[PDB]
Amino acid sequence: LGVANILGGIAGYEDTKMLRSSVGNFLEQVPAFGYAANVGATAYNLAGYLKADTRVNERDYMTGMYNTFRELVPNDPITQKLLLGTFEEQGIHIKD
Amino acid sequence: VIGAGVDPLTYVPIAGQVGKGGKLVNKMFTVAAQSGALAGVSEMARTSVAGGDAHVAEAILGGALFGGGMTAIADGLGRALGRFAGPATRLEARETARNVDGQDLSRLPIQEGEQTFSHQGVKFADVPNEPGSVRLEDGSILIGENPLNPKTRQVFDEVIEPERAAAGVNLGGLTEIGLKLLRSENPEIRGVAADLVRSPTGMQSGASGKIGTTASDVFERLRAVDHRFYNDIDDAVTEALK
Amino acid sequence: ESGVRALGKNLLSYGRQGYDSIEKIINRWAPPNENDTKAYIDSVVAATGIPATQSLDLSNQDTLSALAQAISFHETVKNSMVGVAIRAGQTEDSLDVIGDVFNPTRWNNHKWTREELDQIRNAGVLPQYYGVITGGSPQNLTELINLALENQKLDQEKAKAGTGAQLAAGVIGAGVDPLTYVPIAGQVGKGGKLVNKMFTVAAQSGALAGVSEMARTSVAGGDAHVAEAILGGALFGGGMTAIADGLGRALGRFAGPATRLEARETARNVDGQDLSRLPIQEGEQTFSHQGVKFADVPNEPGSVRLEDGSILIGENPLNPKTRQVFDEVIEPERAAAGVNLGGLTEIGLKLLRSENPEIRGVAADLVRSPTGMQSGASGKIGTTASDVFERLRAVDHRFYNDIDDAVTEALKDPYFQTAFWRDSGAFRQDIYQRVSMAIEDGSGNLKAELTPGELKVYDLLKNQFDAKREMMENPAMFGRPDAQSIFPGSRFKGTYVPHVYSSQMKELYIKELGSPEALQEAIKKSWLTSYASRPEVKKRVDEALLEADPTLTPEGLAAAVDKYANDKAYGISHTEQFERSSVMEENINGLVGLENNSFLEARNLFDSVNNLREWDMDKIVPAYNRRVNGDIAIMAGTGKTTKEMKDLVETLMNKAGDDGKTLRDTLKILTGRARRDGADDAAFATVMRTMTDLAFFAKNAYMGVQNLTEIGGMLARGNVRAMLHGVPMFRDLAFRNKKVGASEIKDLHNVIFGKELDDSIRPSKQDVIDRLRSYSDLGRGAATALGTAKYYTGELAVRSPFTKVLNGTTNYLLDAGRQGFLSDIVEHSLTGSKRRFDDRWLKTAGISDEQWKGIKSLIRESVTRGPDGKYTIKDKKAFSQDQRAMDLWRMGDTIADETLLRPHKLSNMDKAYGPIAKTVLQFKNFVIKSINGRTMRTFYNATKNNRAMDAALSTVMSMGLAGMYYMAQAHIKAYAMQDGRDREYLKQALNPTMIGYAALSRSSHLGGPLGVANILGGIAGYEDTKMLRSSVGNFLEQVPAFGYAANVGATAYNLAGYLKADTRVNERDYMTGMYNTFRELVPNDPITQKLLLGTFEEQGIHIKD
Amino acid sequence: PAMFGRPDAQSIFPGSRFKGTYVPHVYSSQMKELYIKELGSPEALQEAIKKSWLTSYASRPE
Incomplete structure (x- = not known):
């Protein structure tokens, strides 16, 4: 897919900051359904597009950052042990 | 480790x-009153985990093992010949402070009378x-190989790769273009300008623009939902190959 | 401020540089090598709450201003033992109780998702163990679940051992x-149940049938919960008796009711002798009030x-002597005549005795004459208005009794118990809004989101709302075949939910948009979009338009749609016909609104506008029901619309110019327009009058009712005894002997006027309250980052920790303080005094000059004060419909909250205090003493359950506050007696039992938001049916084949359930209504009683004598 | 496109009477070259496509 697609959703925060900067905002309440509850595969039909929340929260940061670094840092320790053993047996350049 | x-x-x-x-908690950086004890162990017949909230805490567990191993290898070679120790300690201190809501012992604040710089609105000072x-401003140290290091981006864009300059990779968004467009004198252009872009003259004081959605609003809504869709299809497909 | 103002900036810079904890700041402030810095850390940790290592957040005022004051303080015969004793002590800073026990700065703010709630639900934890989970972080869910399961297992084993089973044998x-x-x-x-071995013979109660297997048992709703409520009451009574005996023996100087209660229950469970009776002998003196006899007790x-030797204490709300003394001497204005309802029977009897044929022609059809009993001359055609009215009124009250039990169980899902960032009063509005939105949806994705506890509410509401419309469309299903339909628009199908619009939201939107025309255009376009999108809306509008207009043009739709929608938009943006004030206005003087039914022209063809609606069903459903029932009865009985039955009255009165010789009253009582102020008194009077017949044809209900009421009375008595010895103002008002003079009446009447002023203006929605509380925060200080990111208008954590930890208890104190400050503002506005007003208030609240000038002008315009000392308001409906009322209310609330509730510790409070400020301070002091005790600390350490303490501590406020207003009213009334009669009046009015009665009858136990007038209002049918025949016997009818004991819930309320039900009274109604009325005071668990008992032990009560 | 707030917008979908699910069609070029080599002329490819289309009309009713 690519980093341009996985992590490309945070431009909205910058786009919304610069609008006002260059009786405050009359802040709006979320609908009765807090958007924390969304059954998967039913948040993307026609009804899910027209009545959603389009601001950035911490979940986007965490999910995008984890997806970008998936195959390099998995959630199992065997690969690290194999690499460590190989580098022990063959040796590395010590500089100096 | x-x-x-x-x-x-x-x-x-x-x-x-x-x-x-599981999670990482090191006893060398905490007071026993802050982290009381362990709530036993799992029954090992019931447990389950979600997608990404409880997987970062194990990815970091793997990273800790790798760092400790590299430090041991380098120390052995160095002692043998006669001549990876900072980042490992800093990482373990950060994680232990994060899990139990305690002091962060891995910070070095900026004193007074010391030289500072800035690049793209971000300040920094060198480390001895x-x-x-x-x-950074609050005393967080980043190694020179991180993708978020301001000094390395500065040295690239200045001296190493001037052709691929920041101007060649800059996107400002619809905001600045709209602001420039709205400052016109030709009525024919303004007739469509008033409808294409959303002026910042609102904040409960907008003269006009009340009719409904313009192009900007629908564009932003759709572009905001699509990226979530992609982030979900990736995880859906990845699990199917097992 | 007016102090420090330097350490604040220093700590701002320090927090900007990135310092976390106390240790780092202190070590930089004073190097460890030079001077100690070991006892200089404890003195700061003890006086603030935050432990040394734990992280900070210097962007919160609660953590900033608290820490600044705890630093500046530290910068700046004697031979025998007295010299050493005084000269050796040193002063230290005062403790902070709230932070030490709960420690609420470690609580994280994370919104759990669906999967993370399904995991908890599938684990299998019971509702009383959610205390551990709340406030945690996402990485640590499984360990917390394991901890809860381990605690559950340990408690299960302990209960198997047979540990807490010694309460069944009595005290x-x-x-x-x-x-x-x-x-x-x-x-x-x-x-379980209560059986005491001291009042039975071992042959009567043989033995025990073992014990439960403890893995199978279950219980019903109300039939097997009374037997445990009474178990709790027994424990409370025994504890109070022990405390009083100890105090009495100690000094040198609650024993009847406890013994009587235990004797009654033991006699009830095993069908034995009742040893707690004292019969009336011969030669005694007897009295009577409202047909009930009684005699005194020595x-x-x-x-x-009573007649059969049952004794009732003086604070029971069924006591005839206290009602007699009230009605004759104490409150003659609220006389029994002012609270009497006779019913349709007597009015019909009086109406039928007429001579005018025109009146008799309709009288014969409106009412059911008692000349029947198989001898009725006429009236055989079918149902009249009376029959349908009685049937519908009989089924509605059962519906109300069921909706409460349905809703109450919904609030124990983990979704609501673990959210500490929202007020605890908006949960019911949340439930009603979500369900109502899900009903009107056609797709179905919204229905899939509701929790497993809301589907039953969904079913009940849907079924009844369909049944009512089905009845309204065909009113010939009752027996008269020449009746038309009254439903406006009946071609298509759907579910109708009433529409009631707000007014404050309209004013706030008009202020921002600048004109009503902007609101009209917004409404119009938000309507047109639904026509554009959905197909079914297109079909409905097109069919209605084409049948409305004979001309057909393919071009004409683009004009017809708009010229239809414009009128409906103008009907809301430029008038006040559909607002809540006019539709639901309290009282009318005559027939003024019967021309048009405002509930039914809110219907539209279309499908944001939902921002101007109201979602409070507990007050909206009954009024709709009353109006609709009246219309249906009139139409199905007579064959004429309500407008015709109205204008007939004036048509008749046009010929009544001559002085020749009740139709109006009959129509008024049928429609549902009679005054219903103080219906709770009538509700209790009905039971008091018909108790004997219940005692005749049933037995268990009799003793159950008696025990419930006695427990309530005992609780009221104990509370007033404690409050006398606690709070000084209570003592000062309760121990007078003569008329007070000169000054104090002015304060006593400001106390009265504050409550009315607050009640007439308070908003009726939640979003308005949120916005009004949000403006004042932005009136002092915020930033751009606060507007973006999370923040959100849902605000409870931004407040002090006092609101977080104990939320239910705080609302009473806040609502007292607001009323306190409003009267001071009004008095300064009128008289120009300066003894209470302060000019820092304008800057603290956030009021500029223009708002203050407007408020002052309005108050000077609309209110007058007399030389007597009584405030009067000229206009009431127009006064509460201006923009300035919201400004006034916001100012009062902000000032009260900031001045009284924010600053913790008694050393942080800084011109003068009024009559209500002292009361609030003393109640808060009582609470602070209560928390610090050993009992609450041990209970919290054992199980981390903070929900019980708030429930236990709300009742004492709820009762004491009502007692204060009763006393103030008595004093203000006794001032006008010119002679020496005031001494006798005060001797009669200020007895402690009288205070206890007035405190229990008043207050907010009721039945909850619904009310006693609704929960217990269904027993009027028995009285209505007795008087008909009294003023070949009845040919008694058999029940249908289905005995009505079998009714599957939520299916007894559809159309079929209304037309073929049984409408007589049985013991189940008595038991269910009585249990519902006394729910929160006497629960079916014993922890709350133990907490109250421990507190009263530690603090002590007034022993009288 | 009138779901968003402007009531004088038409439709842009070409062909909207019936119902179905649309999945985008993108054709390759190397396979076209290989088949042209095997068959010898573009006309052979045209006839093959035409007949493979007509068979579905022959069989299915919808």
Whole structure:
């Protein structure tokens, strides 16, 4: 897919900051359904597009950052042990 | 690993404990009152985990093992000949402080009377005894190989790759273009300008623009939902190949 | 401020540089090598709450201003033992109780998702163990679940051992020790009862049928919960008796009711002798009030004896003597005549005795004459208005009794118990809004989101809302075949939910948009979009338009749609016909609104506008029901619309110019327009009058009712005894002998006027309250980052920790303080005084000059004060419909909150204090003493359950506050007696039992938001049916084949359930209504009683004598 | 496109009477070259496509 697609959703925060900067905002309440509850595969039909929340929260940061670094840092320790053993047996350049 | 613990070079893990749910807590950086004790162990017949909230805490567990091993290898070679120790300690201090809501012991604040710089609105100052690194405003240190290091981006864009300059990779968004467009005198252009873009003259004081959605609003809504869709299809497909 | 203002900036810079904890700041402030810095850290940790290592957040005022004051303080005969004793002590800073026990700065703010709630639900934890989970972080879910499961297992084993089963044998005689008994949680539904061995013969009660297997048992709703509520009451009574005996023996100087209660219950469970009766002998003196006889009791003044020897204490709300004394001497204005309802029977009897044929022609059809009993001359055609009215009114009250039990169980899902960032009063509005939105949806994705506890509410509401419309469309299903339909628009199908619009939201939107025309255009376009998108809306509008207009043009739709929608938009943006004030206005003087039914022109063809609606069903459903029932009855009985039955009255009165010789009253009572102020008194009077017949044809209900009411009275008495010895203002008002003079009447009448002023203006929605509380925060200080990111208008954590930890208790104090400050503002506005007003208030609240000038002008315009000392308001409906009322209310609330509730510790409070400020301060002091005790600390350490403490501590506020207003009203009334009669009046009015009665009858136990007038209002049918025949016997009818004992819930309320039901009274109605009325005061668990008992032990009560 | 707030917008979908699910069609070029080599002329490819289309009309009713 690519980093341009996985992590490309945070431009909205910058786009919304610069609008006002260059009786405050009359802040709006979320609908009765807090958007924390969304059954998967039913948040993307026609009804899910027209009545959603389009601001950035911490979940986007965490999910995008984890997806970008998936195959390099998995959630199992065997690969690290194999690499460590190989580098022990063959040796590395010590500089100096 | 640092202090008292396992021996990194002789430790073989067991397969199958992926979803049990664990975390890193080091006893050398906490007071026993802050982290009381352990709530026993799992029954090992009931546990389950979600997607990404409880997987970062195990990815970091793997990273700790790798760092400790590399430090041991380098120390052995160095002692043998006669001549990876900072980042490992900093990482373990950060994680232990994060899990139990305690002090962060891995910070170095900026004093007074010391030179500072800035690039793209972000300030920083150099760190002594470790060339290539940098300090942020609140005393967080990043090694020179991080993708978020301001000094390395500065040195690239200045001296190494001027053709691929920041101007060649800059996107400002619809905001600045709209602001420039709305400052016109030709009525024919303004007739469509008033409808294409959303002027910042609102904030409960907008003269006009009340009719409904313009192009900007629908564009932003759709572009905001699509990226979530992609982030979900990736995880849906990845699990199918097992 | 007016102080420090330097350490604040220093700490701002320090927090900007990135310093976390106390240790780092202090070590930089004073190097460790030069001077100690070991006892300089403890003195700061003890006086602030935050432990040394734990992280900080210097962007919160609660953590900033608190820390600044704890630093500046530290910068700046004697031979025998006295010299050493005084000269050796040193002063230290005061403690912070709230932070030490709860520690609320470590609580994280994370919104759990669906999967993370399904995991908890599938684990299998019971509702009383959610205390551990709340406030945690996402990485640590599984360990917390394991901890809860381990605690559950340990408690299960302890209960199997047979530890908390010694309460079944009773307290009096031989049994447990009341003051050192600790119950176990989780045995709610096992099923137990009280049987005392001292009042039975061993042959009558043989033995025990073993014990439960403890893995199978279950209980019903109300039939097997009374037997445990009474178990709790017994423990409370025994504890109070022990405390009083100890105090009395100590000094040198609650024993009847406890013994009587235990004797009654033991006699009830095993069908034996009742040893707690004292019959009336011969030669005694007897009285009567409202047809009920009684006689006095020796050695116990204030009590009374019924005909069969049952004794009731003086604070029971069924006591005839206290009602007699009230009605004759104390409150003659609220006389029994002012609270009497006779019903349709007497009015019909009077109406039928007429001579005018025109009136008789309609009288014969409106009412059912008693000349029947198989001898009725006429009236055989079918149902008249009376029959349909009685049937519908009989089924509605059962519906109300069921909706409460349905809703109450919904608020124990983990979704609501673990959210500490929202007020605890908006949960019901949340439930009603979500369900109502899900009903009107056609797709179905919204229905899939509701929790497993809301589907039953969904079913009930849907079924009834369909049944009512089905009845309104065909009113010939009752027996008259020439009746038309009254539903406006009946071609298509759907579910109708009433529409009621707000006014404050309209004013706030008009202020921002600048004109009503902007609102009209917004409404119009938000309507047109639905026509554009959905197909079914297109079909409905097109069909209606084409049948409305004979001309057909393919071009004409683009004009017809708009010229239809414009009128409907103008109907809301430029008038006030559909607002809540006019539709639901309290009282009318005559028939003024019967021309048009405002509930039914809110219907539209279309499908944001939902921002101007109201979602409070507990007040909206009954009024709709009353109006609709009246219309249906009139139409199905007579064959004429309500407008015709209205204008007939004036048509008749046009010929009544001559002085020749009740139709209006009959129509008024049928429609549902009679005054209904103080219906709770009538509700209790009905039971008081018909108790004997219940005692005749049923037995268990009799004793159950008696025991419930006695427990309530005992609780009220104990509370007033404690409050006398606690709070000084209570003592000052309760111990007078003569008329007060000169000054104090002005304060006593400001106390009265504050409540009315607050009640007439308070908003009726939640979003308005949120916005009004949000403006004042932005009036002092915020940033751009606060506007973006999370923040959100949902605000409870931004407040002090006092609101977080104990939320239910805080609302009473806040609502007292607001009323306190409003009257001071008004008085300064009128008289120009300066003894109370302060000019820092404008800057603290956030009021500029223009708002203050407007407020002052309005108050000077609309209110007058008299030389007597009484405030009067000229206009009431127009006064509460201006923009300035919201400004006034916001100012009062902000000032009260900031000045009284924010600053913790008694050393942080800084011109003068009024009559209500002292009361609030003393109540807060009582609470602070209560929390610091050993009992609450041990309970919290054992189980991390903070929900019980708030529930236990709300009742004392709820009762004391009502007592204060009763006393103030008595004093202000006794001022006008010119002669020496005031001494006798005050002797009669200020007895402690009288205070206890007035405190229990008043207050907010009721039945909750619904009310006693609704929960217990269904027993009027028995009285209505007795009087008909009294003023070949009845040919008694058999029940249908289905005995009505079998009715599957939510299917007894559809159309079929209304037309073929049984409409007579049985014991189940008595038991269910009585249990519902006394729910929160006497729960079916014993922990709350133990907490109250421990507190009253530690603090002590007034022993009288 | 009138779901968003402007009531004088038409439709842009070409062909909207019936119902179905649309999945985008993108054709390759190397396979076209290989088949042209095997068959010898573009006309052979045209006839093959035409007949493979007509068979579905022959069989299915919808």
